[PDB]
Design a protein around this ligand. Structure first.
Ligand SMILES: COc1ccc(S(=O)(=O)N(CC(N)=O)c2ccc(N(CC(N)=O)S(=O)(=O)c3ccc(OC)cc3)c3ccccc23)cc1
Length: 286
């Protein structure tokens, strides 16, 4: 009865409003308060025991479906709360937390492919922009390791990317790192045991099940055990020293499948399934 896995938003026929907490130990799902606005291709994160949903794409009927919204969920009260919106709409967004601050990375607004990045301070409820990335990335994967922010893969508006870059907060500058072996957009990126994992995604022709991690020491991307299902636009997070992937699109079907990665045995495996297949969710743990 400790920490739970929270899934918010997603897509099936349209942008979804579901918020659902999964309990890995007893294997159950709990339906929570809906998002005030349905959104797909959003990102989730956690700061001070609070759940945030960032950007994405809503179901607005006026032609403006790209979201610039930031929303806060309080588990203790089951209340969603609107926060200060970002400086620009960011669909297919990537998020990372450093020292209690949320970084919104890349994403898209219509034909605009953001290389820009902004930082949200919960203690001030403010968004301030920082140094833009070296590359424009939508469908980018973001993760944080030792107070450094990594932007991985994506789509620069012309080509799908295998390249990755690193953000140094104390210098406000970006620095390219070693590229992935695989071209990936809409991948699952996270930090587990001092490595940066990149799972699934879309190489431009197929959805992927291959998985590779990055080591700062050797500066190399090496493959690990592949997922049971190819999937892009998947939700990802860590729980109890294991990696969890949620939903996604395999090319024909919006997956309800949920797989778990054991780094000690280098094994993947389905452990449960969501209440309904869906892609482009945001996920966090608290
Ligand atoms: C037509 O089927 C789909 C597929 C995915 C969705 S989604 O609701 O999920 N969604 C919507 C969004 N808010 O943008 C997303 C769509 C596409 C994404 N990719 C683009 C990118 N730059 O990463 S993707 O690389 O992953 C991809 C590529 C080709 C595909 O067709 C075979 C399918 C997906 C999204 C990437 C991340 C989050 C949402 C995406 C909905 C319907």
């Amino acid at each position: 009865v400790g920490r739970l896995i929270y899934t918010a938003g997603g897509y099936f026929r349209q942008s979804l409003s579901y918020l659902e907490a999964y309990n890995p130990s007893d294997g159950t799902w709990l339906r929570l308060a809906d998002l005030q606005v349905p959104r797909s291709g959003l990102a989730g994160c956690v700061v001070g025991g609070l759940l945030y949903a960032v950007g994405g794409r809503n179901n607005s009927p006026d032609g403006n479906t790209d979201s610039s919204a930031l929303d806060c969920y309080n588990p203790m009260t089951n209340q969603w709360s609107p926060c200060a919106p970002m400086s620009v709409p960011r669909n297919r967004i990537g998020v990372g937390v450093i020292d209690g601050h949320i970084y919104a990375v890349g994403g898209s607004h219509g034909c605009i492919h953001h290389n820009s990045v902004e930082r949200y301070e919960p203690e001030r409820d403010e968004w301030h922009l920082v140094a833009p990335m070296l590359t424009r990335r939508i469908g980018v994967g973001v993760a944080v390791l030792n107070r450094l922010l990594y932007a991985v893969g994506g789509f620069d508006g012309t080509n799908r990317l295998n390249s990755a870059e690193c953000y140094y907060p104390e210098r406000n500058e970006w620095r390219m790192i070693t590229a992935m072996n695989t071209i990936r957009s809409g991948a699952g990126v996270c930090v587990l045991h001092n490595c940066i994992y990149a799972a699934g995604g879309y190489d431009g022709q197929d959805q992927l099940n291959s998985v590779e991690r990055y080591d700062v020491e050797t500066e190399t991307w090496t493959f690990v055990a592949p997922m049971k299902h190819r999937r892009s636009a998947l939700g990802i997070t860590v729980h109890q020293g294991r990696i969890y992937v949620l939903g996604g699109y395999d090319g024909h079907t919006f997956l309800d499948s949920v797989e778990c990665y054991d780094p000690d045995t280098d094994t993947w495996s389905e452990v449960t399934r969501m209440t309904s297949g869906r892609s482009g969710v945001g996920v966090a743990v608290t």
